Paper text:
The N332-GT5 molecule was designed to engage antibodies containing a specific HCDR3 motif (derived from BG18) but bearing diverse VH and VL gene segments. N332-GT5 was designed to induce diverse human BG18-class type I precursors. We conclude that N332-GT5 consistently induced BG18-like type I B cell responses in RMs.
We employed cryo-electron microscopy (cryo-EM) to determine whether N332-GT5-induced BG18 type I BCRs engaged the N332-GT5 trimer with a BG18-like binding mode as predicted by the sequence analysis. We determined structures of three BG18 type I Fabs, each containing distinct genetic features, in complex with the N332-GT5 trimer, and we also determined the structure of the unliganded trimer for comparison. Structural analysis confirmed that all three Fabs had a binding mode similar to that of the BG18 inferred germline (BG18_GL0), with the HCDR3 engaging the base of V3 and the LC straddling the V1 loop. Overall, we conclude that all three BG18 type I Fabs interacted with N332-GT5 using a BG18-like binding mode, which supports our sequence-based definition of a BG18 type I antibody. The approach angles and relative heavy chain-light chain twist of all seven N332-GT5-reactive Fabs clustered around BG18 and its inferred germline, whereas the other N332-dependent bnAbs approached the epitope with a wide range of angles as has been described previously. Thus, the BG18 type I and III Fabs structurally characterized here have clear potential to develop into BG18-like bnAbs.
Numbering used by the authors:
A (entry chain A): 33 to 57, 66 to 141, 150 to 185, 188 to 309, 312 to 323, 323A, 324 to 397, 412 to 457, ...
B (entry chain C): 1 to 52, 52A, 53 to 82, 82A, 82B, 82C, 83 to 100, 100A, ...
C (entry chain B), D (entry chain I), E (entry chain G): 520 to 546, 572 to 664
F (entry chain F): 80 to 127
G (entry chain E): 272 to 309, 312 to 321
């Protein structure tokens, strides 16, 4: 009775992993080989479609990760390799008199370095932070990178301010956006819509506290691959932001010398005024309310008769123990011990920060970068939009954890899925082809 | 529930024209094929014309192929048959009916599912 | 609606938007490889439609009967109460069988047409 | 003449050289990208001809009437006293309108053919 | 048999496996260039079949008579006692002549069809 | 034996100051120059 | 025995055996390996 009829252009798709395109509106994140965005991108709501999403298997996170690493290296490759800087240094404390917390953090070091001509040497005096200088045993010191790899100086003209990057599907593929309020990262979405491209995602690099991200639609959303498994990180998306203000209140001078033909080294010079500690101010009431909301949502997974305690991160490298971010070209490392110090049973906070010039990003070994000093006083005001927590019995203990950068990008890409279109199919039809 | 009412003219002289329209209610008009069937005063039934559900594809009996036009408006729920020449042999009660065709994705019909009351066209 | 707007619609209604998805099928080394693979996929689908005797058509009727084992649903049930995603899952296991039959049907048709043309 | 030899000829005469230009349409990373884009362009034009129901034809008649607002020239005036470059400029603003109508016409034709085939 | 299994078979028998080789025609910078060139070759063959008026067909009859100078073998001799490799060598020198005639034949056919359609 | 096909009754408008072929030729010359002279000798110990 | 040209003495002759001949090489010295660093991120390994 019925015959096979072939249809082409059928709105059917399958899960797929493919290469994505950039879209955008000198910055380290500004790619020349990256197409301009669509000023009026399209979004087509899919009625009566319940697509299953799983943010922990989303290939877009690995693609974004690789794109960030490649762009970073391409941008910082054509600069200055400070191979003649790995020399013995003679160092004393910058301010003997100072009794402030910043005592011995800044050291006044002398070294020979090089000059334009091979046959000449000079004497260079510069200031270094304690975190960049390791004792050999006026004392002799070496830079921390001398025991790992050669260090490349970032070009001073390159800005590190995040620029939103939009990801676009190649033809033959489509991106599905969950749009389901309070979606926890896995399972069906009831409000799925098809888009050509994602919204802009800022490649903000941070740990423990996620800055300048998206907010939850109605309430704090706690997402995890496995709540029971203590080895997984918990991504907490806040519904309201917490404003955080960091300052580097020292009018720091920047000096430079030439080190070879076509090469110059920039270094931290005189500190004018008093030497002061870098720090962030977070309002106590806002943080306390935000943390209480997080506790309530955790109780929904652990019970109404449990105890939720926050504690400081365990010992380890500075890059993972404490909060870390790029502020005005400087790389800040803070503490957070005053944020996660509370037991929950059913006007400003000041966090100290240290600045480090020898940078080892993305958890790579042997990829040291020298961040040039930034002249003057630096201030940044950021929005805290999410947290990373790990879990350590009546009392559960949570710690900031973090350190794996894909967790930050996943926190933005969780709403998107890439699918491949399979336009060809068959169906019974009461239609016979004319015979011969 | 389902109703079809024919409205049209009365007495026409040979060489003229007459438009007959069937108004439908009680069902989705655009979901069914429509046709016209006529009965001469002293004879049985004979098929006259068939139009599909969309209205773009039509069929006629040879005796009226150059004289009758069948059309439908699915927004007005109206089926219209515009007849020309109208010979003495065309005097008959004309009926509109639902059925007679199905658009490939529907189960087969090849029968006239629902009939109206009819209207008499006299030449 | 636009691209994939009919994805949640019944099989019948979605057949009226076949051209929209078709237009959106075709629309640094890794990106170039992706474009090349998209072209190869498109051509594989066009070649397959060519082999079956459909060529430049979006709706193509054939001479292969429905087995009834592949799916035993009513014709109106399939076209009025199912989406294309559900249908694709329902007959996934028989896709290659159907494709094989379609190829064989066209081969016989081509030979018969040639022999019909050979008659003086 | 050869490729584009008829460019300055009247619209009528140039229709006899449609195959010459067609053959010349298909005939280090930037160069590879250029070849890939040339392939995508060619396929976009072939897909568009497919959607309209023309497929492998260089001259294809359709069922879309001429609006008369797009151009009100006489038929002999257009074919005997104009070149294709002048014509393309003359109706540039109506190109997308015409394309939309052509797509709709083929969709109706396909449904009517399917329903005609469905008759036992 | 599978791909090229009929290569040593007679011309007649091998015509029943035309789809097998066709499927296998389409199936780091140098490798990407190779894929792009394979795509261009495939499209050149498809364009050539389009120009001749064959389009999506594997067996296509035409209106060009056999010259008898190209090959003077009997019809049964060619189809029953030769392979396609031998035939391709036998008429290699006339390939371009045949192709030219095929193009001209289709051009006349298209004009005649257009003029036939123009009759009210 | 390159081909040239004269176009009769064609009056194309040219503008040499907007001709993208000049920038393409420029880039090709710069790239070729650098590719050709890259694998040679860097006289870093000569700056004495 | 395969050759481009047997007569031409400038060509090599490739002889494919139908049976294999087992060959056993040994380096019977318990050689120590030592290493030093030579620069940041670079190390040299040497025979000790
Ligand atoms: C989260 O987003 C906020 C913005 O909503 C962002 O704060 C912004 O940071 C940038 C960079 O630190 C600030 O831009 C600077 O503003 C000062 C104002 O005095 C300027 O002097 C700076 O100019 C320097 O850099 C230029 C190169 O761009 C040089 O040409 C110039 O000579 C100076 O050297 C620069 O424009 C911006 O003002 C703030 N915005 C606000 C509202 O404070 C924050 O950093 C983001 N957080 C994270 C973690 O990314
Ligand atoms: C961040 O600050 C906290 C204090 O608020 C530091 O924690 C203390 O570290 C000392 C060792 O220096 C321990 O003896 C204390 O027991 C720790 N706890 C407290 C409450 O003082 C923490 O080490 C700081 N972070 C870093 C990276 O130094
Ligand atoms: C710089 O080199 C001179 C060479 O005579 C040496 O005496 C001096 O101590 C060096 N400076 C430092 C800081 O090691
Ligand atoms: C030198 O590097 C090694 C790792 O290769 C590390 O374990 C060691 O602590 C480093 N030296 C110092 C003084 O930190
Ligand atoms: C889907 O999101 C839109 C906002 O874009 C909202 O108006 C609509 O109610 C949502 N639907 C559901 C089922 O949540
Ligand atoms: C921070 O949050 C406020 C709302 O509380 C918003 O107006 C502001 O734009 C946010 N800033 C960023 C950088 O997201
Ligand atoms: C955030 O969640 C709390 C939960 O009590 C709610 O009171 C507050 O209004 C929410 N804020 C927004 C902006 O939705
Ligand atoms: C997310 O929601 C789904 C609902 O099916 C549930 O099965 C899953 O365990 C939830 N995951 C978390 C981390 O809450
Ligand atoms: C989650 O982690 C627990 C840890 O004990 C394990 O038993 C459970 O099987 C895990 N669930 C999944 C879905 O992996
Ligand atoms: C830093 O010192 C310079 C000296 O010229 C002065 O102009 C500038 O205002 C100072 N900035 C601060 C924040 O003291
Ligand atoms: C470092 O110490 C020397 C000692 O003579 C002094 O001249 C120099 O100014 C100091 N560095 C800075 C930045 O003040
Ligand atoms: C951060 O700075 C803004 C002014 O830009 C101020 O209103 C806000 O209170 C500051 N936050 C804290 C915690 O001091
Ligand atoms: C503020 O913190 C205290 C603990 O120091 C806690 O008892 C109180 O409930 C918190 N307030 C809110 C609104 O969470
Ligand atoms: C806590 O109590 C509320 C009722 O107030 C209930 O809805 C909720 O499910 C309880 N949570 C747990 C984890 O049992
Ligand atoms: C945490 O709370 C305790 C009181 O329970 C207090 O003594 C301590 O200073 C607080 N801060 C840290 C970093 O432990
Ligand atoms: C969704 O399903 C409902 C079922 O009642 C239907 O009325 C509606 O038209 C459907 N919408 C689509 C497929 O867009
Ligand atoms: C239906 O499929 C079975 C194999 O699953 C086959 O044996 C049977 O002949 C098929 N029916 C028809 C009518 O071809
Ligand atoms: C399918 O058709 C049969 C009659 O052949 C009928 O009994 C059955 O109920 C129908 N099923 C549906 C879902 O229409
Ligand atoms: C396809 O075969 C597998 C065999 O395990 C079976 O589980 C699945 O349900 C089958 N699907 C269909 C649509 O028959
Ligand atoms: C050019 O125009 C003249 C007009 O008199 C015409 O005779 C001639 O054939 C044309 N040549 C072309 C189009 O090659
Ligand atoms: C001609 O185009 C106009 C719109 O510009 C339209 O309103 C009119 O109906 C068209 N004529 C025909 C015959 O379709
Ligand atoms: C076009 O045809 C009309 C007659 O319908 C005639 O009056 C007019 O002159 C013709 N124009 C041209 C250019 O042939
Ligand atoms: C197209 O529209 C523009 C509107 O500014 C007009 O200037 C131009 O002449 C139009 N071209 C045609 C062929 O109608
Ligand atoms: C090979 O040639 C022999 C000739 O006797 C024929 O019988 C056989 O079928 C051929 N086999 C092929 C073409 O595979
Ligand atoms: C056969 O080819 C010759 C040229 O080699 C040609 O002159 C002759 O006319 C051709 N025969 C036919 C029937 O066309
Ligand atoms: C070809 O046919 C002719 C008759 O026209 C016959 O004499 C000749 O022997 C045949 N040759 C072959 C090889 O069949
Ligand atoms: C093609 O022409 C060449 C001319 O040297 C000749 O040697 C060869 O045999 C010819 N081949 C055929 C099949 O006519
Ligand atoms: C290989 O065999 C062929 C057989 O035709 C012979 O002509 C050739 O000389 C041989 N070559 C060698 C190296 O034996
Ligand atoms: C093989 O080498 C000899 C060397 O004298 C030469 O004379 C002969 O022509 C060569 N043969 C070929 C086929 O190259
Ligand atoms: C080489 O010396 C090491 C020393 O630890 C010993 O363990 C090993 O067995 C020796 N090997 C031989 C072959 O003598």
């Amino acid at each position: 009775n019925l015959w096979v009829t072939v249809y082409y252009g059928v709105p059917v798709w399958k899960d797929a992993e493919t290469t994505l395109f950039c879209a955008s509106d000198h910055n380290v994140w500004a790619t020349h080989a990256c197409v301009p965005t669509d000023p009026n991108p399209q979004e087509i709501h899919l009625e009566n479609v319940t697509e299953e999403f799983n943010m922990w298997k989303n290939n877009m996170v690995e693609q974004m990760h690789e794109d960030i690493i490649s762009l970073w290296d391409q941008s910082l490759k054509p600069c200055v390799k400070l191979t003649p800087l790995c020399v013995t240094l003679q160092c004393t404390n910058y301010a003997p008199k100072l009794r402030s917390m910043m005592r011995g953090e800044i050291k006044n070091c002398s070294f020979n370095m090089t000059t334009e001509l091979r046959d000449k040497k000079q004497k260079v005096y510069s200031l270094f932070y304690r975190l960049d200088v390791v004792q050999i045993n006026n004392k002799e010191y070496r830079l921390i990178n001398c025991n790992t790899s050669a260090i490349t100086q970032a070009c001073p003209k390159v800005s590190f301010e995040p620029i939103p990057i939009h990801y676009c599907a190649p033809a033959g593929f489509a991106i599905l956006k969950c749009k389901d309020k309070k979606f926890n990262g896995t399972g069906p979405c009831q409000n799925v819509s098809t888009v050509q491209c994602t919204h802009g995602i800022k490649p903000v690099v941070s740990t423990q506290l996620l800055l300048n991200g998206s907010l939850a639609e109605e309430e704090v959303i706690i997402r995890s691959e496995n709540i029971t498994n203590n080895a997984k990180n918990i991504l907490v998306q806040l519904n309201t932001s917490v404003q955080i203000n960091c300052t580097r209140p020292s009018n720091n001078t920047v000096k430079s010398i030439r080190i070879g033909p076509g090469q110059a080294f920039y270094y931290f010079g005189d500190v004018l005024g008093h030497v002061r500690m870098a720090h962030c101010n977070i309002s106590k009431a806002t943080w306390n309310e935000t943390l209480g909301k997080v506790v309530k949502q955790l109780r929904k997974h652990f019970g109404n008769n449990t105890i939720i305690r926050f504690a400081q991160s365990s010992g380890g490298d500075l890059e993972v123990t404490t909060h870390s971010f790029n502020c005005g070209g400087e790389f800040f490392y803070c503490n957070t011990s005053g944020l996660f110090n509370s037991t929950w049973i059913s006007d400003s906070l000041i966090l100290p920060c240290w600045i480090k010039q020898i940078i080892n990003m993305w958890q790579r070994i042997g990829q040291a970068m020298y961040a040039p000093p930034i002249q003057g006083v630096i201030r940044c005001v950021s929005n805290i939009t999410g947290l990373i927590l790990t879990r350590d019995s009546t009392t559960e203990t949570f710690r900031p954890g973090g350190g794996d950068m894909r967790d930050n990008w996943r926190s933005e890409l969780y709403k998107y899925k890439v699918v491949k279109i399979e336009p060809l199919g068959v169906a019974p039809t009461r239609c016979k082809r004319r015979t011969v | 529930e389902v109703q079809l009412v024919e409205t049209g003219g009365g007495l026409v002289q040979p060489g003229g024209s007459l438009k007959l329209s069937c108004r439908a209610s009680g069902y989705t008009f655009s979901s069914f094929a429509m046709s016209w069937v006529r009965q001469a005063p002293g004879k049985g039934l004979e098929w006259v014309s068939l139009i599909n559900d969309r209205g773009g594809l039509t069929f006629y009996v040879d005796s009226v192929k150059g004289r009758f036009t069948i059309s439908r408006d699915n927004s007005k729920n109206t089926l219209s048959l515009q007849m020309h020449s109208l010979r003495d042999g065309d005097t008959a009660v004309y009926y509109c009916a639902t059925g007679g065709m199905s658009s490939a994705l529907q189960s087969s019909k090849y029968y006239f599912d629902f009939w109206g009351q009819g209207a008499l066209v006299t030449v | 609606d636009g691209f994939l707007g009919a994805a949640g619609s019944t099989m019948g209604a979605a057949s009226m938007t076949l051209t929209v998805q078709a237009r959106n099928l075709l629309s640094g080394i890794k990106q170039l490889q992706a474009r090349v693979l998209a072209v190869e996929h498109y051509l594989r689908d066009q070649q397959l439609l060519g082999i079956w005797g459909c060529s430049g058509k979006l709706i193509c009727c054939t001479n292969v009967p429905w087995n009834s084992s592949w799916s035993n649903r009513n014709l109106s049930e399939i076209w009025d109460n199912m989406t294309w995603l559900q249908w694709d899952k329902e007959i996934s296991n028989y896709t290659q069988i159907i494709y094989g039959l379609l190829e064989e049907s066209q081969n016989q048709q081509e030979k018969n047409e040639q022999d019909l043309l050979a008659l003086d």
